[PDB]
Design a protein around this ligand. Structure first.
Ligand code: BCL
Ligand SMILES: *[C@H]1O[C@H](CO)[C@@H](O[C@@H]2O[C@@H](C)[C@H](O)[C@@H](O)[C@H]2O)[C@H](O)[C@@H]1O[C@H]1O[C@H](C(=O)O)[C@@H](O[C@H]2O[C@H](CO)[C@@H](O)[C@H](O)[C@H]2NC(C)=O)[C@H](OC(C)=O)[C@H]1OC(C)=O
Ligand code: HEC
Ligand code: HEC
Ligand code: HEC
Ligand code: HEC
Lengths: 299, 71
């Protein structure tokens, strides 16, 4: 029944995070115990034999096989190469029946997406980075999948919408800001969702005496903003265009593809996997010329 | 039937009657004024052939927007 607290702002401002100590320990142990361990890695010479490899062109043959073992355990359970492949012919993108191996052609896109996350959105994911495990956590479906439902659904802030500001940056009313109180309710609903997605409260990113202030806010607010821009790219360019690839059992009632949100990576924790650093161990997924000064072992 | 005024005091009945007719007329006028087909203050001059029909969809307008430009 003890409560852990973390101070995140100045003395006396009550910018604090509170956790039920028992509840947090069970959540944390529930991550530790399943956390999948990595293979060791090794450094051969020699030219690449692959017949139909289009993304992983740039890694050694040993690093490639090491990556496939990781992908199996992170998405399908360990050694489950049959989840993606016609195991008699790994280069195939179709079954013997000619029907396409939809998971393999999705997984090729998910590699490009992961490289794009780890490369272009380092202002968000920094040197923790993401792997397939971050979303999938050992299962084919991540958490927090969402579909079209209503026009005013706030999760469209992570796809095709842009503005969320409502506060005036001046004393007097002006034509610059004609925001409705209903729009402030909409931002408030959106912000509760982000708070729950991380398991934090509003004071993690704001001094609530002025929500619009960046100077009074913790630096996490700047990281959070880059998370919005990242999700828009992830949803608009990688997840949403996979609509013709999935079986109709995966699609939404509008026939749209499942889309991601903050909770998909974070799963109610302030960092994904409480900050477990795995991307550093898998250069196939860096999308980056060095990871924290460790250079990419390219061929 | 005039004996209704022996059991009920007409002083009290007429206030309740006036109030009931008042709320009923006001409800119906406000209902119509909010409809598409019978918004007579905006569209009263349209002919019946060009007045709205079938506009029963429960979200005809955008729910969320800025206020109109403030001038
Ligand atoms: C586009 C125009 C609108 C409209 C616009 C308005 C507006 C605006 C107003 C009314 C008003 C009234 N409307 Mg109209 N009205 C519409 C269509 C209807 C229809 C229908 C089925 O289509 C009916 C039955 C009515 C009926 C009525 C009355 C209740 C009322 C005025 C007379 C009154 O109360 O006298 C006493 C008589 C009755 C209640 C009976 C009506 C006549 C019937 C046919 C007689 C037979 C016996 C009767 C059914 C017994 C009922 C029990 C009662 C205790 C008497 N309207 C259409 C949709 N109507 C006015 C109002 O609310 O006044 C208070 C008003 O301001
Ligand atoms: C699934 O289908 C694809 C079709 O693209 C097959 O991919 C082939 O191999 C790739 C390396 C190559 O890049 C690609 O262009 C393509 O040549 C994949 O191997 C899977 O094959 C099975 O289904 C195929 C299909 O298209 O239905 C089928 O191929 C058929 O068409 C080719 C001519 O394009 C012809 O040679 C086959 O005889 C014909 N077969 C049938 C049953 O219709 C494959 O058939 C054969 C003999 O390979 C299927 O694989 C098997 C083991 O039968
Ligand atoms: C999806 C989650 C997969 C799992 C599970 C496994 N593999 Fe894989 N494989 C996958 C993709 C998307 C690709 C193409 C990569 C690209 O850059 O296009 C591959 C490719 C291979 C290959 C190369 C075949 C060739 O073109 O010559 C091999 C040899 C391979 N994969 C082996 C392999 C093993 C041994 C696996 C389990 C231990 C395994 N794969 C799982 C997707 C997925
Ligand atoms: C969140 C940022 C993810 C990252 C990191 C990875 N994946 Fe992904 N994956 C994600 C979503 C939102 C979905 C759609 C879920 C659905 O309903 O299908 C997927 C889907 C897949 C699939 C298909 C699963 C299935 O339909 O059975 C595969 C095979 C897959 N993802 C593979 C994969 C790989 C290989 C990844 C890292 C290289 C990877 N995913 C990362 C979200 C995210
Ligand atoms: C980081 C994980 C945050 C949490 C927790 C909360 N907020 Fe937030 N807020 C955050 C960002 C990155 C932004 C900008 C969003 C954008 O798309 O521009 C905001 C913005 C707001 C605003 C609007 C400020 C303005 O200038 O009008 C409000 C009113 C707001 N946030 C309120 C709010 C509430 C009520 C929260 C907890 C329930 C909350 N925020 C948490 C980052 C984060
Ligand atoms: C995976 C593709 C993620 C998505 C979707 C979101 N976040 Fe994220 N976030 C991710 C990682 C790997 C990390 C750790 C980076 C690091 O600092 O090492 C983070 C971190 C944050 C933080 C910083 C936490 C802190 O230390 O204070 C915040 C505030 C945060 N993330 C917010 C956030 C929001 C608001 C998101 C949706 C709009 C969101 N994240 C999505 C990975 C991913």
């Amino acid at each position: 029944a003890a409560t852990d607290t973390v101070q995140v702002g100045y003395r006396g401002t009550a910018m604090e995070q509170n956790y039920d100590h028992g509840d947090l320990k069970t959540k944390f142990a529930q991550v530790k115990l399943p956390q999948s361990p990595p293979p060791a890695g090794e450094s051969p010479p020699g030219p690449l034999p692959w017949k139909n490899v289009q993304v992983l062109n740039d890694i050694s043959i040993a690093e490639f096989n090491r990556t496939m073992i990781a992908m199996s355990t992170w998405v399908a359970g360990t050694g489950n190469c049959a989840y993606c492949h016609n195991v008699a012919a790994f280069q195939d993108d179709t079954l013997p029946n000619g029907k396409p191996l939809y998971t393999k052609i999705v997984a090729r896109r998910m590699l490009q997406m992961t490289r794009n996350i780890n490369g272009n959105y380092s202002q968000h994911v920094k040197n923790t980075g993401v792997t397939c495990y971050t979303c999938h956590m050992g299962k084919p479906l991540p958490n927090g999948l969402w579909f079209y439902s209503s026009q005013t659904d706030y999760l469209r802030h992570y796809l095709d919408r842009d503005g969320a500001r409502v506060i005036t940056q001046g004393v007097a009313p002006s034509n610059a800001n004609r925001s409705s109180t209903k729009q402030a309710e909409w931002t408030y609903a959106l912000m509760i969702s982000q708070s729950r997605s991380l398991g934090v409260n509003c004071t993690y990113c704001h001094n609530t005496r002025q929500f619009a202030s960046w100077r009074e806010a913790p630096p996490a607010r700047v990281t959070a903003y880059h998370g919005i821009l990242m999700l828009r790219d992830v949803n608009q360019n990688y997840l949403a265009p996979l609509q013709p690839v999935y079986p109709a059992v995966r699609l939404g009632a509008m026939g749209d593809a499942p889309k991601a949100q903050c909770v998909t990576c974070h799963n109610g924790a302030y960092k994904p996997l409480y900050g477990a650093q795995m991307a550093k161990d898998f250069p196939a997924m860096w999308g980056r010329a060095d990871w924290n000064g460790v250079p990419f072992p390219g061929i | 039937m005039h004996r209704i005024w022996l059991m009920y005091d007409p002083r009290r009945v007429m206030v309740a009657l006036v109030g009931f007719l008042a709320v009923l007329a006001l409800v119906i006028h406000f209902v119509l004024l909010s409809s598409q087909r019978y918004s007579w203050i905006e569209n009263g001059t349209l002919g019946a052939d060009q007045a709205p029909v079938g506009a029963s969809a429960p979200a005809a307008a955008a729910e969320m927007s800025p206020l109109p430009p403030g001038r």
